[PDB]
Amino acid sequence: NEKWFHGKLGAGRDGRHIAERLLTEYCIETGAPDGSFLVRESETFVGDYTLSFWRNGKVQHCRIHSRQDAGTPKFFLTDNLVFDSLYDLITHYQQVPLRCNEFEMRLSEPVPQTNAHESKEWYHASLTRAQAEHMLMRVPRDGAFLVRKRNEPNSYAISFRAEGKIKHCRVQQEGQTVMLGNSEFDSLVDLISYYEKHPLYRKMKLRYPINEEALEKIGTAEPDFGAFYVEANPM
Numbered sequence: 220n221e222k223w224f225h226g227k228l229g230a231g232r233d234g235r236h237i238a239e240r241l242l243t244e245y246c247i248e249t250g251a252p253d254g255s256f257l258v259r260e261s262e263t264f265v266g267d268y269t270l271s272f273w274r275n276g277k278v279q280h281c282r283i284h285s286r287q288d289a290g291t292p293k294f295f296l297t298d299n300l301v302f303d304s305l306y307d308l309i310t311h312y313q314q315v316p317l318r319c320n321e322f323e324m325r326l327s328e329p330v331p332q333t334n335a336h337e338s339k340e341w342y343h344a345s346l347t348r349a350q351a352e353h354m355l356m357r358v359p360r361d362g363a364f365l366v367r368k369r370n371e372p373n374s375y376a377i378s379f380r381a382e383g384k385i386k387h388c389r390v391q392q393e394g395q396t397v398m399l400g401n402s403e404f405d406s407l408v409d410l411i412s413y414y415e416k417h418p419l420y421r422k423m424k425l426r427y428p429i430n431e432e433a434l435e436k437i438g439t440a441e442p443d444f445g446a447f448y449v450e451a452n453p454m
Contacts, residue, residue: 223309223329227260234262238271239278246273250287253285253325258305259281268305270296270317274324281319283308333395334409336366336375341428343367348387351378355385356442357434363427366390366407375407379415381423386449388419402454419451 223328225241228234239260246255259267261282270285283305284295294308295301296317302308309326310394316323334434336342343351346367354365355378364379377399378385388409391398397407404410 220329221306222331223257224305225227225257225259225332232262233271234259238269238280242271242273242278242330242331243394251330254310254325255330256305256309256328257330258309262341268294270309270326271325272324274322279319281317305309328348331354331405331408333392336411339408339409339411339428340367340430341365341425342407343430348378348450351376352385352446353379353442354429354434354438355405356444356446357438357440358427359439360427360430360437362423362425363429363437364425365429366411377411377419377425379420379425381420381425383445385446387447388451393438400453402451417452420449 225238226239229237238257242255242257244249244360249452253274254272256270258268258270258396261267263268264282264284267285270281270283272279272281281296284298286293286295291303293301293303294305294435296308296312300311302311307309313326316325329372339342343365344367351365351367358380361380361383364377366375367375368374369389370378375392377388378387388399390410397404397410399410404413411425416424418424427437
C-alpha cells in the first residue's frame with residue numbers, strides 16, 4: 220500500500236520530532252528492522268518530502284526532492300535517478316540500497332499511522348455515550364455505527380444499533396495496535412474495515428457511517444425509543 224506515506228505530520232514545524240517519536244515508538248515496540256520507514260512533507264525544503272527511517276536505534280532523515288519536467292511531478296533522492304511518483308521511489312529503494320550520509324542501506328518495513336481514523340466519517344473525537352445514543356436513535360437503520368473517543372486514556376468506543384437496540388463495544392489503543400477483547404488489529408481503520416465485511420455483534424455488520432450529514436440524509440427529527448459494555452464476536 221502507501222501505509223508509509225504520512226503526508227503533513229502535526230503542527231507545522233514539529234514534524235521532524237513527530238517522525239522520530241512515531242518511528243521510535245514503532246521500531247522499539249514491534250521489534251522492526253533497520254530500514255523501517257515512512258514519508259512526509261518537508262519541514263525545511265518547501266514542496267519536498269522527507270524519508271525518515273530506522274537504523275542502529277537512531278532515526279536518520281533523507282530529503283526526497285520534488286521538481287516538474289513538462290509539468291509532470293518527478294521525485295528523487297539523487298538527480299542521476301528520478302521517478303514518476305513516491306511509490307516508485309520507495310519501491311526502488313526497498314530493492315536496491317540508498318546512500319544517506321556515508322552508509323548504504325535498503326528500505327524495509329513500511330511504518331503505518333495509528334490515527335488515520337481521525338479523518339473518517341464514522342469517527343467522533345468529542346462525543347459522550349449519551350450524545351452518540353441520541354444520534355444513533357435519530358437513525359432508524361441497523362448496522363449504522365459511529366466510533367468515538369472515550370474519556371479514559373488510549374480508548375475508543377464503537378456505538379451501534381443492533382436488532383433495533385443501541386449497544387457499545389470498547390476498543391483500546393495498546394501502543395501500536397488496538398484490542399477489542401482478546402482480538403487484535405493493526406488499527407481502528409483496519410478493525411472497522413474487518414467489521415464492515417464480518418459481523419461485530421450478532422448478525423450485524425458495520426454498513427452505515429453516521430455523522431451530522433448522515434442524520435440529514437437519513438435520520439429522524441425525534442430520538443426516543445428503547446435503546447453497560449457489550450462483548451463482540453471473537454476474532
